[PDB]
Design a protein around this ligand. Structure first.
Ligand SMILES: [Zn+2]
Lengths: 76, 338
């Protein structure tokens, strides 16, 4: 199935995934296209930041849902 | 004066304090804590995260029973949030929006009015008009996620995906608790918040390597994807994407984004023939630094009295409204106008 990622500057990308895809898998697919390492990526869907070890199915993410890609401004 | 307590820095914890102050000045969330209404909503049984809600509420209660110049320690609260979200163990610098998402998730889960989530199976709703499909998808979401936290922060996006060959528009409805906005790069005379909202809600061309599969055409096709807001939240949190897309080394985007104090009118972003909302600003989380490090503060308007203050850990100082809009703004907290 296809899902979408709204990336950093205005663009959207399209991913081919299965419901069983892990969040790590999804981040790897984003890296394949965008060259942003998985350890930098944060993916937001329905207010949840998606966590490594879990699958798309765990979050009930269905076809044509959009994940929101954000990085970090670390601060103390 | 009420609600002007500072929060102790526990070791790089201003990202946390900034968010906590923004939440402290989220009128209805504050009131939920002060009136102890969370007690009725807490789940029965020995739960690992009951104390997360209790310590959050206790902290807000303490802030709103303080005298000016008071400094409150959020150490007990930190213990609870790091138990819920172990990434906040220790004393490293962190992202405020990341913290916000984990904190609100924890609070929401622990006061969820739904105590046993129904599984739910996917349904074919092609027979329904767009708006009715939206309403049904919303009902399905609420039967799983229904809390006071949601009452305030949750809205619904519509994503419309049109195949340029057959003309079929496939619609999906995604809940949201905040919106993360790309920063405009071609703005004149300045970059505005509306410019950033437009980048979020614009027609996105999906072609080449981004071609979706059209189920009607039975093949990959150029499609146009567009967001609109189907349901507006009571509290709108806007998160500015202040990071470059460099494939080598991310840099912070420090562009001034001009955001309004009053009358943020989102008419143009509402779904077709759907009632829109207008908002006033009440809080800002500011970041000063780089992507790898820096310092957080908050600017917050006290509910009802309308006075702005800068919250910088232990230091709480009055400020003019002319000082609120800065390039350091990272998270904007808006509430419905009048
Ligand atoms: Zn088609």
């Amino acid at each position: 199935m296809q899902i979408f990622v709204k990336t950093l500057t205005g663009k959207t990308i399209t991913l081919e995934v299965e419901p069983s895809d892990t969040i790590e898998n999804v981040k790897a697919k984003i890296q394949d296209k965008e060259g942003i390492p998985p350890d930098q990526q944060r993916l937001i869907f329905a207010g949840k930041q998606l966590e490594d070890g879990r699958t798309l199915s765990d979050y009930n993410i269905q076809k044509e849902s959009t994940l929101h890609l954000v990085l970090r401004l670390r601060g103390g | 004066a009420q609600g002007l307590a500072g929060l102790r820095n526990l070791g790089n914890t201003c990202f946390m304090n900034s968010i906590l102050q923004c939440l402290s000045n989220t009128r209805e969330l504050r009131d939920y804590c002060l009136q102890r209404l969370y007690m009725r909503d807490l789940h029965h049984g020995s739960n690992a995260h009951t104390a997360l809600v209790e310590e959050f509420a206790k902290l807000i209660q303490t802030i709103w029973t303080s005298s000016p110049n008071d400094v409150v320690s959020p150490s007990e609260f930190k213990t609870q949030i790091q138990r819920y979200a172990p990434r906040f163990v220790g004393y490293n610098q962190q992202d405020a929006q990341e913290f916000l998402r984990f904190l609100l998730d924890g609070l929401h889960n622990e006061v969820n009015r739904v105590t046993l989530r129904p599984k739910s199976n996917p349904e074919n709703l092609d027979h329904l008009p767009d708006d009715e499909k939206g309403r049904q998808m919303w009902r399905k979401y609420l039967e799983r996620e229904d809390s006071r936290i949601g009452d305030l922060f949750v809205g619904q996006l519509k994503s419309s995906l049109t195949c340029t060959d057959c003309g079929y528009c496939s619609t999906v409805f995604d809940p949201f608790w905040d919106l993360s906005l790309p920063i405009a790069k071609r703005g004149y005379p300045e970059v505005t918040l509306m410019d950033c909202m437009r980048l979020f809600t614009k027609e996105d061309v999906l072609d080449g390597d981004e071609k979706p599969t059209c189920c009607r055409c039975r093949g990959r096709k150029r499609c146009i994807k567009k967001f609109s807001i189907q349901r507006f939240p009571k509290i709108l949190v806007l998160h500015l994407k202040r990071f470059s897309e460099s494939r080598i080394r991310t840099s912070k985007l420090t562009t001034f984004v001009n955001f309004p104090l009053r009358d943020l009118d989102l008419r143009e972003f509402a779904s077709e023939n759907t009632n829109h909302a207008v908002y006033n600003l009440y809080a800002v989380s500011n970041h000063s630094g780089t992507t790898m490090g820096g310092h957080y503060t908050a600017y917050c308007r006290s509910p009802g009295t309308g006075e702005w203050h800068t919250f910088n850990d232990s230091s709480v100082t009055p400020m003019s409204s002319s000082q609120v809009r800065t390039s350091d703004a990272y998270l904007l907290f808006y509430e419905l106008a009048s």
